[PDB]
Amino acid sequence: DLEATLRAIVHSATSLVDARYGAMEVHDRQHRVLHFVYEGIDEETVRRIGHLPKGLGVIGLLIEDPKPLRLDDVSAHPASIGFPPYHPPMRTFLGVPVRVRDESFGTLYLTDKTNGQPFSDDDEVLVQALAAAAGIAVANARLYQ
Tell me the number of residues near ligand HEM by CB under 6 A.
29
Give the strand pairing for 93-100 and 19-27. Answer: unpaired
Interaction mask 54-93, ligand HEM, x per CB under 6 A: xxxxxx--------------xx----xxxxx--x--x--x
Task: Tell me how far apart the alpha carbons of residues 70 and 75 are, in angstroms, rounded to a whole number.
Answer: 12
Is 87 annotated to bind a ligand? Reply is yes
- Quick one: what does residue 140 bind among a second copy, Ca ion, ligand HEM, none, with the CB cut-off 5 to 8 Å set by partner type? a second copy
| Least CB distance to ligand HEM at residue 122 (A) | 19
Q: Counting Cβ atoms within 10 Å, is residue 26 exposed (0-12), middle (13-18) or buried (19+)?
A: buried
Residue of 106, 111, 123, 130 that binds ligand HEM (CB under 6 A): 111
How far separated are the first and last CA of the chain, in Å rounded? Answer: 12
| Residues between 8 and 37 with contacts to a second copy, criterion CB under 8 A | 8-9, 11-12, 15-16
| Least CB distance to ligand HEM at residue 80 (A) | 3
Measure the CA angle with vertex 22, ends 123 and 109; round to 5°. 60
